A paper describes a structure:
The HLA-A*11:01 allele is a member of the HLA-A*03 supertype and is prominent in many Asian and Oceanian populations, including Indigenous populations who are a high-risk group for severe disease with influenza virus infection. Whilst HLA-A*11:01 favours peptides possessing Val, Ser and Thr at P2 and basic (Arg and Lys) residues at the C-terminus, HLA-A*02:01 favours those possessing Leu and Met at P2 and hydrophobic (Val and Leu) residues at the C-terminus.
The 9-mer M141-49 peptide also adopted a canonical conformation within the cleft of HLA-A*11:01. Similar to the NP511-520 peptide, the P9-Lys of the M141-49 is buried in the F pocket of HLA-A*11:01, forming a salt bridge with Asp77 instead of Asp116, and interacts with the hydrophobic patch formed by Ile95, Ile97 and Leu81. Structural overlay of the bound NP511-520 and M141-49 peptides, with an average root mean square deviation (r.m.s.d.) of 1.52 Å, showed that despite sharing a similar backbone conformation, the overall peptide conformations are different due to the exposed side chains. The antigen binding cleft of HLA-A*11:01 for both structures adopted a similar conformation with an average r.m.s.d. of 0.45 Å. Re-stimulation of PBMCs with individual IBV-derived peptides demonstrated that peptides in pool 1 did not produce robust CD8+ T cell responses, while M141-49 from pool 2 was the only peptide to elicit significantly higher IFN-γ+CD8+ T cell frequencies than the DMSO negative control. The conservation of IBV peptides was 99.9% for M141-49 and NS1186-195 and 90.7% for NP511-520 across all IBVs from both the Yamagata and Victoria lineages detected from 1936–2019.
Author numbering:
A (entry chain A): 1 to 275
B (entry chain C): 1 to 9
C (entry chain B): 0 to 99
The structure:
């Protein structure tokens, strides 16, 4: 099916004190493969996948240079954005940058993206056309005009619809055993009495990949939204994910309720009921 | 492969 | 300037069975800024040699981290996770429940 390569950069200025803390993380779907920390002893691009450990020593040194250049540019960017927003020098600020390409079931390019942020909120984005920019405010408009004059939108489209897809197709072949997997969830129901006239019904789903899963509670096939608690898809730490949906039911009415589990790895969605 | 052409803002 | 409160989750890697080795997880999500102090507790005392994942974010730029340590659950022993962030007034602790 579809696939996605992604990069996440986080440049935080230490107010007390040092070089701006820089974390670079690389993913292929919901799987990490590269790592770069500024406070690390290595000072190199580090592998976090078995199919990337088989890459030449010339590769690991090129990645280190590009990521080091990206960090030092972000180091001065923090010092330029403090002027655009007329903020103090004794403040900690964050520059979160994300970009990536998409590959369809066929193999060819589908979506190209770049989203940049400052202090939680959005800053500048690269559109679906990959030729125009989207500034969040009047301060970010200066960055848009600077990137339009330098014709930086062409360097982005070159790296997104080419090379990114050329290396993502290479990554999907080098790791055709690790990434092409669709682990279906291992579901189960638990029942805990909360009151002398009401009880909680928890529906589990463990060991699934990819993280995208739908846990839906129903009462007579009718989607139960009220009296429902849902937790965010959590990592297992072994390359799989976990999720649960709980529902508060009147005691004796356990049988009326039903939990539906939808996932890529399952051929037909599950239906769990209490006995 | 990371972005090789980094632009100053 | 925008700031978000961390969402904590305390769970084990596999379904907890007393005596068999596992991994205690503490997944902190939806927080901003990035600077956060996360601890894992065994009967009130800190667990030394605790590893964590690399800092990444979500759709709303919210940060997430997984703090993990190898452990052996027993009926007597109680586990928890101590989290400290700039948004919070006091460090909040969430105990580990074998079904949560
Ligand atoms: Mg994102």
């Amino acid at each position: 099916g579809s696939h996605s390569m992604r990069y996440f950069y986080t440049s935080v200025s230490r107010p007390g004190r040092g070089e701006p803390r820089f974390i670079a993380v690389g993913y292929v779907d919901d799987t990490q493969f590269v790592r770069f920390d500024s406070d690390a002893a290595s000072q190199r691009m580090e592998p976090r996948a078995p199919w990337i450990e088989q890459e030449g020593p010339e590769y690991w040194d090129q990645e280190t240079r590009n990521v080091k250049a990206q960090s030092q540019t972000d180091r001065v960017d923090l010092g330029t954005l403090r002027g655009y927003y007329n903020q103090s020098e004794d403040g900690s600020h964050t520059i979160q940058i994300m970009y990536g390409c998409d590959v369809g079931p066929d193999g060819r390019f589908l979506r190209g993206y770049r989203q940049d942020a400052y202090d939680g909120k959005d800053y500048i984005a690269l559109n679906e056309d990959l030729r125009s920019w989207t500034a969040a405010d009047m301060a970010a408009q200066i960055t848009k005009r600077k990137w339009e004059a330098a014709h930086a939108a062409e360097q982005q489209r070159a790296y997104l619809e080419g090379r990114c897809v050329e290396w993502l197709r290479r990554y999907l072949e080098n790791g055709k055993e690790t990434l092409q997997r669709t682990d279906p969830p291992k579901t189960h129901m638990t029942h805990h009495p909360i009151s002398d006239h009401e009880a909680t019904l928890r529906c589990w789903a463990l060991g699934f990949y990819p993280a995208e899963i739908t846990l839906t509670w129903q009462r007579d096939g009718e989607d139960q939204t009220q009296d429902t608690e849902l937790v965010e898809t959590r990592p297992a730490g072994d390359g799989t994910f976990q999720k649960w949906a709980a529902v508060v039911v009147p005691s004796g009415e356990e049988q009326r309720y039903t939990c539906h589990v939808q996932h890529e790895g399952l051929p037909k969605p599950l239906t769990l009921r209490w006995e | 492969s990371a972005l090789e052409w980094i632009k100053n803002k | 300037m925008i700031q978000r409160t961390p969402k904590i989750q305390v769970y084990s890697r596999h379904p907890a069975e007393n005596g068999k080795s596992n991994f205690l997880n503490c997944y902190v999500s939806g927080f901003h800024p990035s600077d956060i102090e996360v601890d894992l507790l065994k009967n009130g005392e800190r667990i030394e040699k605790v590893e964590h994942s690399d800092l990444s974010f979500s759709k709303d730029w919210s940060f997430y981290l997984l703090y993990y340590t190898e452990f052996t659950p027993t009926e007597k022993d109680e586990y928890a996770c101590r989290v400290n962030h700039v948004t919070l007034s006091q460090p909040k602790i969430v105990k580990w429940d074998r079904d949560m």
